[PDB]
């Protein structure tokens, strides 16, 4: 006992109630909370495998793919992205990146750590890519893989994906897409759109807690991952091992690492919620709830950051920071006086935007009113600073 | 035309069985910890989420006995903690010595090779352990930058003494990375005093915690090495400079890096609370007592224990030699089908040579030892003979 039992740890755990209207994680409805409080089962029991299997069907549904190599990564969005990158890229492979926000920048950082010859196409916070711009990119750097971000949480932008699959394949290159927008925004049809890898952190698209990530790989991608002459740099994210345990190959399942049993309860149950509601109904709900916010922000005299309404990520909306205010003051006001969490910017967008989130069953008209009164009080009572 | 209709399986209620988990972990969760798991979300970067991280950290300092400011939760499982440690400390080309006496050693090796280390295993059959003399011959021959040792071998049921190994490794200018699931039951662990430079565990293996989070600690010698390398480590997700910052271990303010598993952390904290109330000494007693009573009850069933020396027996995970004439799969399956009790066979080098029975935290009761003993007794009676 160099260290006595902590004093802080002898008090009951107490957490505040907060309405979470940032980019995610969001609040959890009762059913999903309940799943989180259930008892443990064996991390390699037949029921645990039955659950994984249902989850997998869920990921197939929410993504629209027949890919047998579909599975949950035992970590967050950064971990899914990495798993994808660490497997598909061999040290020395050319890697093209759609760097129009932080998630692009992250892709780049990871790709450099793992020895890829990274080639960013950089665009200021606000922008998106055209089939033409990507094609010039594909010609110039002859890459093995393209990263694109579908839903940009940094900038509030919704990248159209139609065409990009068939373009990348025509240049003998795969297409990795980071989507949080598959539930609200535009429909996603992986197989049809020709996307070769598609990933998301459960907590960003579903009403799920953080710690787990949905991922899917096309056969073209498997081919590339499974035929490389070097071993990928991680064992934790090694896809051969992971595919086996998740039941995506012929053989019996081997111990690899321990999956987060409890979260998987919740993940499954969240994939259930959407499975009942249906994709089409969920698209409507978000697109309707967003619009009403867009309208209510403008009535507060707030300028939306993404000028073209067609390029607006419904799940995460970006407001331009009003002239004469410190964005920190506003963000802090909304949390202190209304227990509402919003967010400023992130990476390139830092300090240029506010970020407001409408995620799943929190994408209500009521919550848009609650956050609209909060901002309206904040615009009223915060100081005018020299920016 | 949707390619894939809404799954039929997913329109039915989630239903799970009740199972007494007496394998190596995860174990069953007491009510308090279940409750924590069912609470509402808070901001993944709110001041309260930071207050919770900080308490957790104190917990890890207590359960490990360290003043190390570079202590934190890895946002992944034990393989992920080990990797984070290895990916940061080892630079491609560094000599790395490994105490390969079970699977976890073998995993260390696999990881070290993927990240370009010149790995040097000291291999020993399932059953064995290392002596200060054996390690020293190793330290001389391969002049390594780091040594991996497994404290509690869940593969073989062995309890590696750690005394001496810190001061030895430092005398040869090399760090000491230890994988311990035995800090709660078995032998006391005093990281700082034992000279251990890195120490990790998957919450679910030592605490009554759910999987998905891992406790880790680094000495200042280790920070020095991780923070002064000329190359970037191969992972961003486990990059320690970034992680140390977000977990509040350095001077600066906290930056978005990745999203920590809020809900699991509730549970992790609450489990570190449970032990904080019980106290380390009381927990050591409880496990060591509960193990002994099992050892005695298995022998009365005519079962041979796998680790011959009683001093080298990991209390938290016990290995029985598979009785002559029996398929181990039959027995394992009998226990689950007729008593809702989960035990395990072997793993890696130990595969098909052992059964593995677990006594973890508040499941380390005398009642559960009876329940599993009666299961095995019935299994010896109803399973095929040979």
Is B46's Cβ below 8 Å from some Cβ in A? yes
- Mark whether B72 and B120 lie in a shared domain: yes
**Which of B232, B260, B278 is at the close of a domain?**
B278
Q: Is the peptide bond before A25 cis (omega within 30 degrees of 0)?
A: yes
Q: What gap in Å lies between CA A142 and CA B312, rounded to an integer?
A: 58
Neighbours of A351 (CB within 10 A): 12
Total domains in the fold of chain B: 2
Question: What's the rounded Cα separation, in Å, for the pair A315 and A174?
Answer: 27
**CA–CA distance from B199 to each of A14, B71, B97, B121, B257 (Å)?**
30, 10, 16, 19, 23
Residues 6+ away with beta carbon under 8 Å from B13: none
Residues A189, A320 within the same domain: no
Pair B229, B299 in one domain: no
Instruction: Give the distance, in angstroms, between the CA of residue A158 and the centroid of all CA atoms in the same chain.
Output: 13
Strand B354-358 versus strand A316-320 pairing type: unpaired
Residue B180 burial (10 A CB sphere; 0-12, 13-18, 19+)? buried
Give dist(CA B208, CA B271) in Å, integer.
6
Do B258 and A79 count as a contact with CB atoms less than 8 A apart? yes
Last residue of a domain, one of B242, B258, B278: B278
Residues of B within 8 A of A257 (CB-CB) are 77-80
A179 & A291 share domain: no
Question: How many Å is the maximal CA-CA distance in chain A?
Answer: 66
Distance from CA of A21 to the nearest CA of B (A): 10
DSSP class of residue B140? H
Strand-pair partners of A213: A73, A201
Task: Give the list of residues 6+ apart from residue B89 with CB closer than 8 angstroms, or none.
Answer: B145, B146, B175, B177, B198, B222, B225, B226
DSSP 8-class letter at B180: -
- Report whether B186 contacts B168 (CB < 8 A): no
CATH classification at residue B297: 3.90.1150.10
Say whether both B214 and B356 belong to one domain: no
Interchain CB distance below 8 Å, A41 and B5: no
Beta strands in B168-256 (DSSP E): 175-179, 198-202, 214-218
Nearest alpha carbon to residue A312 among A130, A206, A184: A184
Residue B77 — φ and ψ, nearest 5°?
Answer: -90, -175
Are B232 and B305 part of one and the same domain? no
Q: Could B6 and A276 be called an inter-chain contact, meaning their C-beta atoms sit closer than 8 Å?
A: yes
Q: In what order do the strands lie in the sheet with B118-123?
A: B71-74, B214-218, B198-202, B175-179, B146-150, B95-100, B118-123
Compute the nearest-CA separation of A187 from chain B (Å): 11
Closest to A25 measured CA to CA, from B258, B240, B248, B271: B258
Residues B98 and B180 grouped into a single domain: yes
Nearest C-alpha neighbor of A213 from the set B9, B49, B76: B76
Rounded to a whole number of angstroms, the CA Rg of chain A reads 22
Question: Which of A344, A27, A309, A316 is CA-nearest to residue A179?
Answer: A316
The answer to whether the Cβ–Cβ distance between B43 and A341 falls below 8 Å is yes
Q: b/e per residue, A239-255, with b = 16+ CB within 10 A?
A: bebbbbbbbbeeeeeee
Q: Are residue B224 and residue B337 in the same domain, yes or no?
A: no
Closest CA to A82 of A156, A176, A209, A157: A176
Q: How far is CA A224 from the centre of its chain?
A: 24
Phi (first) and psi of residue B214, to 5 degrees: -145, 135
Length of chain A: 387
The CATH number linked to B251 is 3.40.640.10
Contact A343, A23 (CB under 8 A): yes
Between the alpha carbon of residue B31 and those of residues B27, B170, B358, B362, the distances in Å are 13, 44, 20, 11
User: How big is the CA angle at A259 (ends A256 and A261), to the nearest 5 degrees?
Assistant: 150
Boundary (domain end) residue, out of A277, A305, A326? A277
Query: SS3 letters for chain A?
Result: CCCCCCCHHHCCCCCCCCEECCCCCCCCCHHHHHHHCCCCCCCCCHHHHHHHHHHHHHHHHHHCCCCCCEEEECCCHHHHHHHHHHHHCCCCCEEEEEECCHHHHHHHHHHHHCCCEEEEEECCCCCCCCHHHHHHHHHHHCCCEEEEECEECCCCEECCCCCHHHHHHHCCCEEEEECCCCCCCCCCCHHHHCCCEEEEEHHHHCCCCCCCEEEEECHHHHHHHCCCCCCCCCCCCCHHHHHHHCCCCCCCCCCCCCCCHHHHHHHHHHHHHHHHHCHHHHHHHHHHHHHHHHHHHHHCCCCECCCCHHHECCCEEEEECCCCCCHHHHHHHHHHHHCEECECCCHHHCCCEEEEECCHHHCCHHHHHHHHHHHHHHHHHCCCCCC
Before B26, cis peptide (omega within 30)? yes
- Do B273 and B320 belong to one domain? no
Report the DSSP beta bridge partners of residue A73.
A213
In which domain, by residue range, is A122 found? 29-277
To one decimal, the resolution in angstroms is 2.9
Strand B20-21 with B146-150, pairing: unpaired
Neighbours of A66 (CB within 10 A): 10
- Residues A18, A117 within the same domain: no
| Shortest Cα distance, chain B CAs vs residue A385, angstroms | 23
In this complex, which of B34, B234, B273 lies closest to A113 when CB atoms are compared?
A: B234
Supply B124's token pair: 């020993």
Count the neighbouring beta carbons within 10 Å of the beta carbon of residue B32.
Answer: 15
Task: State how far the Cα of B109 lies from the Cα of B150, in Å rounded to an integer.
Answer: 12
Do the chains contact at B260 and A22, CB–CB below 8 Å?
Answer: no
* A189–chain B Cβ distance below 8 A for any pair: yes
Alpha-carbon distance A110 to B232, whole Å?
10
At residue A52, what are phi and psi to the nearest 5 degrees?
Answer: -55, -40
Query: By the 8 A CB rule, do B315 and B187 touch?
Result: no
Q: Are B139 and B175 in contact (CB under 8 A)?
A: no
Q: What are phi and psi of B121, to 5 degrees?
A: -80, 145
As a whole number of angstroms, the distance between CA B211 and CA B203 comes to: 7
Chain B nearest CA to A186, separation (Å): 15
Is the minimum CB–CB distance between B379 and chain A shorter than 8 Å? no
A336 and A255 within one domain: no
Phi, psi of B210 (to 5 degrees): -80, 155
In which residue are the tokens 């080990």 written? B82
CA distances A326 to A305, A330, B133, Å, are 17, 7, 64
Provide the 3-class DSSP secondary structure of residue B218. strand
Contact between residue B108 and residue B82 where contact means Cβ atoms under 8 Å apart: yes
| Domain co-membership, A376 together with A292 | yes
Cα distance between residue B35 and residue B31, in whole Å: 6
């Amino acid at each position: 006992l160099l260290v006595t039992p902590p004093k802080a740890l002898l008090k009951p755990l107490s957490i505040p109630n907060q309405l979470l209207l940032g980019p995610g994680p969001s609040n959890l409805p009762p059913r999903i909370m309940a799943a989180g409080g259930l008892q443990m089962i064996g991390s390699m029991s037949k029921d645990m495998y039955q659950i994984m299997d249902e989850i997998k069907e869920g990921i197939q549904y929410v993504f629209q793919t027949r890919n047998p190599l579909t599975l949950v990564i035992s970590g967050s969005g950064h971990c899914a992205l990495e798993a994808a990158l660490v497997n598909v890229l061999e040290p020395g492979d050319s890697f093209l990146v759609g760097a129009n926000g932080i998630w692009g920048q992250r892709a780049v950082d990871i790709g450099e750590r793992i020895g890829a010859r990274v080639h960013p196409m950089t665009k200021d916070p606000g922008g998106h890519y055209t089939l033409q711009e990507v094609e010039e990119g594909l010609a110039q750097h002859k890459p093995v893989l393209l990263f694109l971000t579908h839903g940009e949480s940094s900038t509030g932008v919704l990248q159209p994906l139609d065409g990009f699959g068939e373009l990348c394949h025509r240049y003998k290159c795969l297409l990795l897409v980071d989507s949080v927008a598959f539930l609200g925004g535009t429909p996603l049809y992986m197989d049809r759109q020709g996307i070769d890898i598609l990933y998301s952190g459960s907590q960003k698209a579903l009403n799920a807690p953080p710690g787990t990530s949905l991922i899917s790989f096309s056969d073209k991608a498997k081919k590339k991952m499974y035929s490389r002459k070097t071993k990928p740099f991680s064992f934790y994210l090694d896809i051969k091992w992971l595919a086996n345990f998740w039941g995506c190959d012929d053989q019996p399942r081997m111990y690899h690492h321990t999956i987060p049993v409890i979260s998987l309860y919740s993940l499954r149950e969240s994939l259930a919620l959407i499975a009942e509601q249906g994709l089409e109904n969920s698209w409507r709900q978000h697109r309707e709830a967003a619009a009403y916010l867009h309208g209510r922000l403008q009535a507060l005299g707030l300028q939306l950051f993404v000028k073209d309404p067609a390029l607006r990520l419904p799940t995460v909306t970006t407001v331009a920071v009003p002239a004469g205010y410190d964005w920190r003051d506003i963000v802090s006001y909304v949390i202190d006086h209304f227990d509402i969490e919003i967010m400023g910017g992130l990476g390139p967008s830092t300090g240029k935007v506010l970020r407001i989130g409408l995620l799943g069953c929190n994408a209500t008209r009521e919550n848009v009113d609650r956050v609209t009164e909060a901002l309206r009080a904040a615009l009223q009572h915060c100081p005018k600073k020299k920016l």
